[PDB]
Each structure stands twice: as C-alpha cells, then as structure tokens.
Amino acid sequence: WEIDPKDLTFLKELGTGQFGVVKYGKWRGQYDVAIKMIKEGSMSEDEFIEEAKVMMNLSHEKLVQLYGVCTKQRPIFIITEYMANGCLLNYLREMRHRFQTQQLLEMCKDVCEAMEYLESKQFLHRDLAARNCLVNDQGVVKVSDFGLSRYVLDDEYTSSVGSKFPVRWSPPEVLMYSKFSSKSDIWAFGVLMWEIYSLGKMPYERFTNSETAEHIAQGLRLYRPHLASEKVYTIMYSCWHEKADERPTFKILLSNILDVMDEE
Numbered sequence: 001w002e003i004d005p006k007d008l009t010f011l012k013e014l015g016t017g018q019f020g021v022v023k024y025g026k027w028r029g030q031y032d033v034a035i036k037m038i039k040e041g042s043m044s045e046d047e048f049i050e051e052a053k054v055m056m057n058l059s060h061e062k063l064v065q066l067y068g069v070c071t072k073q074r075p076i077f078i079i080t081e082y083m084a085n086g087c088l089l090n091y092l093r094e095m096r097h098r099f100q101t102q103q104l105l106e107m108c109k110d111v112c113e114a115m116e117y118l119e120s121k122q123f124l125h126r127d128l129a130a131r132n133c134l135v136n137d138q139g140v141v142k143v144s145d146f147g148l149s150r151y152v153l154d155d156e157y158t159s160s161v162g163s164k165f166p167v168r169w170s171p172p173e174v175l176m177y178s179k180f181s182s183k184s185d186i187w188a189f190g191v192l193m194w195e196i197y198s199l200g201k202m203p204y205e206r207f208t209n210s211e212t213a214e215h216i217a218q219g220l221r222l223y224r225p226h227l228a229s230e231k232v233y234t235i236m237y238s239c240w241h242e243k244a245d246e247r248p249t250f251k252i253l254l255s256n257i258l259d260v261m262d263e264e
C-alpha cells in the first residue's frame, strides 16, 4: 500500500478540488497514474492510511483503482488509476454537442456494475453522484471516492443538515435520520441516472437544498429527462421508493439495464 515517492514522475496538473490538487504522472517512468496531494486538515489521515489497503482490495474494472499512498511526507499523496477524461459531470456537459443516446445507457451500466460489486462486499459508497465518477480515455465511466466521506473532517459536508451535504442525491431516511445503507446508494444511483440522461443538469435546480429535502419528503420526484425513454425512466424511478426496502438491489438494476439495452 505504501508507494515510494522516488518512483513517481509528475507530468501535468489536472485540477483541484475539495480534497486537494490532482496531477497526472508516471510510476517507475512507465505506468500512468493520477496523484492527489491531500489538502491539509481535510481528511482523517491516520485512519485513511490504516484502511487504504481495504479500498485497494476493492478491485473491479468499473471502480477507479486506488494503487496506494505516499505517507512519509507532508502532504500525503493518494495514487490512483488515471482517468484522462476527468469527472463525469463535466464530461456529460461536453457530450451535449456530440453523442448517441445508446452511450447514455452504457454509462449507467458501467456505474451499475461497479455498485453491484460494492453491494456484494456490503461496502457503502455514501456519495454516488456524477461529480464522483470519472471517465477514461475510452469513454468508460468508473466510480471513484467510494467510502471517502467517512474520513472527511468538515461537518458541513458529512452532516445531513450541513450546507455542503449531498441533499439532492439523498433519500428521505438519510435526510431525516442519517440512515445509510445499500438502499441509500440505490437512491443516489437513480439521481445519477437522471444526471446522465439530463447531460449534467443539476437535480431539482429550481429549489434550494432545504426546499429539495421538503420536496422529497412530500413524495415529489425528478421529471423524466427528454432523452430517457419511459423504460429508462421506470428504472431510475424504481430507485426512489419512499420505503428503502421497496427499492431494488444493484443486481436487479443491472439486469433491468441490460434488458433495455437488448430491447432498445
């Protein structure tokens, strides 16, 4: 799990975010990697380092691989698979100019495969959204930052009443009782399908976070994006049953997605 910084070559800065600056580089001069230089005070570093091996064991082709950490310096670096097309949210917005609707369903299938694998390990993502998915050079969407919110220090992001909490991707039991489960990741997956079919629009854009929480509690749900067929909308809507036990599993969503692919 411990990578020697001597083996990294830094080649270009890709951007920055909540948890630090990201650079593209090579490991041992040969293998592409992305390197995130963790923002001081943003994460519970000792706890993340001890459990970096846990996340490194989650190996599925549709999960962005965590390769290791560099911890013998400040700041700590997190080394991952390089995703040349960057975050899915921005990539959807760029796609508006040139795309086939069948590509949208393939993106949903990629994320659903990763989530079925996490579900099989009873591993909660806790913040599934287009901004936490990445896209590689071949247009494959993969899920990233799985389980990271448990190590975030800022309560504005982790608390269900924090200004920065992902309210628009949360079911009623998370907003009210902070009750996370595989079924809250299912709800967020339905919102992510809506983000894909809306080419990166913000969910519930006319409403504030507090209004959105009330809207959801009243049973109101996102509309069908015009690119989604009624069969696709039925799948995303199935993620939004008020009762968590009524929502499907990722194995069921994957089969439904594969049925629509085989039919349309």
Ligand SMILES: COc1ccc(F)cc1C(=O)NCc1ccc(-c2nn([C@@H](C)C(F)(F)F)c(N)c2C(N)=O)cc1
Pocket: 014, 015, 016, 017, 022, 023, 034, 035, 036, 055, 064, 065, 066, 078, 079, 080, 081, 082, 083, 084, 085, 086, 087, 134, 144, 145, 146, 147, 148, 149
């Ligand atoms: C799989 O990783 C994890 C799994 C579990 C967990 F709990 C935490 C992590 C984690 O912290 N990973 C560190 C990391 C995260 C995202 C990028 C990245 N970001 N971006 C862009 C948006 C940008 F703009 F930031 F560069 C890429 N293209 C990136 C790229 N990989 O090409 C790089 C490294």
